[PDB]
């Protein structure tokens, strides 16, 4: 039952907030890999591009916290 726990959600939020420079609660696709590296993951470039093409299906090159949480849950 991969249910993200409250502590796992908090650690993800602190890491997500570090790349939110304007306090808008969102991060760009180019900073996703760095957030992942700060979270303890080592993704390849092709895996990063695929994660980018899925979250930006409409084409706005930006990721909000809930979309980031859903990508995390699918990877767990």
The answer on whether 54 is annotated among ligand-binding residues is no
Angle at 1 between CA 48 and CA 55, to 5 degrees: 25
For residues 49 and 35, give the distance between their C-alpha atoms in angstroms, rounded to a whole number. 15
Q: Is residue 26 marked as binding?
A: yes
- Cβ(37)–Cβ(15) below 8 Å: no
Q: Is 62 annotated as a binding residue?
A: yes
24 in a known ligand binding site: yes
Q: Which residues are annotated as a binding site for Ca(2+)?
A: 20, 22, 24, 26, 31, 56, 58, 60, 62, 67
Q: Which residues are annotated as a binding site?
A: 20, 22, 24, 26, 31, 56, 58, 60, 62, 67
């Amino acid at each position: 039952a991969d249910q993200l726990t409250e502590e796992q959600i908090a650690e993800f939020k602190e890491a997500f907030s570090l790349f939110d420079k304007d306090g808008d609660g969102t991060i760009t696709t180019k900073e996703l890999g760095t957030v992942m590296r700060s979270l303890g993951q080592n993704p390849t470039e092709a895996e990063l591009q695929d994660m980018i093409n899925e979250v930006d299906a409409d084409g706005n090159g930006t990721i909000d916290f809930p979309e980031f949480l859903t990508m995390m849950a699918r990877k767990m």
